[PDB]
Structure 1
Amino acid sequence: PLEPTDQDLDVLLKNLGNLVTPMALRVAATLRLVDHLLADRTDTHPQALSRLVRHLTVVGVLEGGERPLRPTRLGMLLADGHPAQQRAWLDLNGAVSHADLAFTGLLDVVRTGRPAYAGRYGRPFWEDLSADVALADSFDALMSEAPADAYDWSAVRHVLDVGGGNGGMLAAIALRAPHLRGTLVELAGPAERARRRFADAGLADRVTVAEGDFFKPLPVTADVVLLSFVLLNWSDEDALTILRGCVRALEPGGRLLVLDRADVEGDGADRFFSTLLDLRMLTFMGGRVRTRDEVVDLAGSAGLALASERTSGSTTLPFDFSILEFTAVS
């Protein structure tokens, strides 16, 4: 029988089992401490704050105090202008950090498969973003060349982006390739941001917004259909019906492009971030991160076969994702 050491127990207490520090880092981010210093210009109880700072000091985020109180190298990651933007990710008014707090309901989540977001905040995730302007804006800012660059658009005329958000990706494919038409299918909130972006990019003549619900049949056909970070939001049955709607909308010889996290045997991709994203999707909305093989198999059920596979990444965070091109079977 295996026997824990002093170092195992130290890792459990300080890292793997530690819920205090992650909360302390979120509070610190939500007071721009690594900026505000460059801490009581903050509406904070004076005693409470130094108690927090003492903890932030011990875990390698600050130094100094009663020589001078300055962030460490690590501490700089909560610097507003750092290109990892971890300060905004951790900010408690932001939509992700806000969602993260629902992890305290993880017990029920695992008992039942059901999301926790509603239990903590009233509305399920997407409904909450559209009724609350501030969470929509912050989520938007956090999720802002992969497809436009990875793909030969010369043999394509019409791209239908399903659940394509504020239109950023469709705008860019269209700006890169002047000959293309595009159509975006989205809920109201992101649809309206799409209209504004298309109009200001001078694309309204060839790139349109069709507000709607991707569980209902898609309004148009197209020779390329895009599902970019959509499937992971949904359960198998729900992702199956989105896929099936996508197949119907596919012109002859048309291609479905799935942009998502899709791990492969010897990928080299950090499984930590795969499981983390996975538990987030489970907890926030009952979705799931799927591997390459699982996506392929769900696509097969919807009448689609894999034609090609490629990778992209991130100029910011350690996150490899894939683009999986599918054709109709019959």
Structure 2
Amino acid sequence: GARSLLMQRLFGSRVTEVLAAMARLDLADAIGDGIADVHDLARSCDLPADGLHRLLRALAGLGMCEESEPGKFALTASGALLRKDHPESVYDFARFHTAPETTRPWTNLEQALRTGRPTFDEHFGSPLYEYMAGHPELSARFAAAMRGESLATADTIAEHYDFSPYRTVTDVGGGDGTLITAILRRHPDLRGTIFETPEIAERAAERVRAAGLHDRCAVVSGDFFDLVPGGADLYLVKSTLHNWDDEHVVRILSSCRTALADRGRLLVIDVVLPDRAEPDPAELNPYVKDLQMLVLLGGRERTRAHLDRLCARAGLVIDRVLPLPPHVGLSLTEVVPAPA
């Protein structure tokens, strides 16, 4: 009901703290595939039996564990995803989004709404990507966090978009190559390029080699404000434009239009907000993502009209917006050069 929903929302931060503790204490990996005794687990994470038992009971109450017998715990499917070693692990995603770096800025949300610029810079002393360039461990966590988030998109995009017409695809800000890898796996003849910062490009190059795609997927580093590597039939930009304000987005789309030339297409893979806000079944709430982009980066999520206008300016026109399965929350916006 109306009261239950409100009460749920209000206790959200306490629920997050319970999940944060599970992740920080690596309890998912400690439990693993079996039934674990709380007394055995207590001598793994430096908590006493009583304290750990109360935390595990909360995690069972939140659908992350099962208490088969008093003091005996197994993971649910949800709990399994917080294992470091799970094939679709969101452990790094969980650690990143519960780290002081991503949560402290939210304590100052009203200031971000008042100033219209991020509170991250005030707390940590530089813009997020400048900061991560100086903190390799956070940069590594971020790369693995974005891999975890992008799995839902990577596992669905090729069944919702026809990649067969293209010889070459370049992923602009393509992270560790999670998205392009998934596309290349389904198209053996297709050639890929990941365009990233020098720091993340190191991660992508290792991922491409480890995945055995080095023969037909290359990695190139630079600044998408400077240029996007030319020559490709298709360009992807996923979860990238929402990191930047309108003028910075135009500059990225400007670099993209130069690379598109005559027979180049751009696929913007991002939240497409409705003109009228309403509840959304996406695994991550798109309006919470919007405010995340504000406090961390001074970015935002955008409507089709808002993006259509930013395209228009870049000498680009939104051709067509294609949906993904509703749990994903992202859409595929096809962008081509404007008649002019």
Q: Does residue 1:231 correspond to 2:231, yes or no?
A: no
Question: Normalising to structure 2: TM-score of the pair?
Answer: 0.76
Task: Return the offset for 1:207.
Answer: 3.2
- The answer to whether the aligner puts 1:23 opposite 2:17 as a matched pair is yes
The aligned counterpart of 2:287 is 275
Letter matched to residue 139 of structure 2 = A
How much does 1:100 deviate? 2.5
Q: Which structure 1 segments of 5+ residues have no match?
A: 1-6
> If you compute each CA radius of gyration, which structure gives the higher value, 1 or 2?
1
1:257 Cα offset (Å): 0.7
Length-normalised TM-score, structure 1: 0.78
- What's the offset of the Cα at 1:111? 1.8
Q: Which amino acid aligns with 2:257?
A: V
Tell whether 2:146 aligns with 1:143: yes
CA distance in 2, matches of 1:110, 1:158: 41
Matched, 1:196 2:206: yes
Alignment-mate amino acid for residue 277 of structure 1: K
The answer for unaligned runs of 5 or more in structure 2 is 148-154
What is the alpha-carbon distance in structure 2 between the residues aligned to residue 217 and residue 146 of structure 1? 29
Counterpart of 2:297, as a letter, is M
Between the aligned partners of 1:253 and 1:124, the Cα distance in structure 2 is 36
Whether contact under 8 Å (1:181, 1:207) holds in the other structure is yes
Count of equivalent residues: 316
Report the alpha carbon displacement of residue 264 of structure 1 after superposing the two structures with TM: 4.0
Distance change >3 Å, CA 273–CA 134, structure 1 → 2: same
SS at match of 2:264: strand
Other structure's SS at 1:253 match: coil
Which residue number corresponds to residue 302 of structure 1? 314
Answer yes or no: is the 8 Å Cα contact 1:102–1:284 preserved in 2: yes
Which residue number in structure 2 is paired with residue 153 of structure 1?
Answer: 163
**Structure 2 counterparts to residues 166-205 of structure 1, below 5 A:** 166-205=176-215
Are the structure 2 counterparts of residues 29 and 256 from structure 1 closer, same or farther at C-alpha, using a change threshold of 3 Å? Answer: same
SS in 1 for 2:265: strand
RMSD of aligned residue pairs (Cα, Å) = 3.7
Deviation at 1:216, TM superposition (A): 0.5
Q: 1:274 to 1:126 in 2, by over 3 A?
A: same
Aligned equivalent of 1:4: none
1:120 alignment partner in structure 2? 123
Partner residue in 2 for 1:329 = 338
Q: Which amino acid aligns with 1:270?
A: P
> Judging changes above 3 Å, is the alpha-carbon distance between structure 1 residues 71 and 263 closer, same or farther for their aligned structure 2 residues?
farther
> Does structure 1 conserve the Cα–Cα contact (< 8 Å) formed by 2:146 and 2:175?
no
Q: Which residue matches 2:97?
A: 96
Deviation of 1:232 (Å): 0.9
Aligned CA distance change for structure 1 residues 158 and 27 (closer, same or farther; 3 Å): same
Distance 1:22 1:304, change over 3 A: same
Matched to 1:140, the amino acid is: A
- Alpha-carbon deviation of 1:206? 4.1
Q: Is the 8 A contact 1:161 1:183 kept in 2?
A: yes
Give the Cα separation in 1 of the matches to 2:107 and 2:306: 29
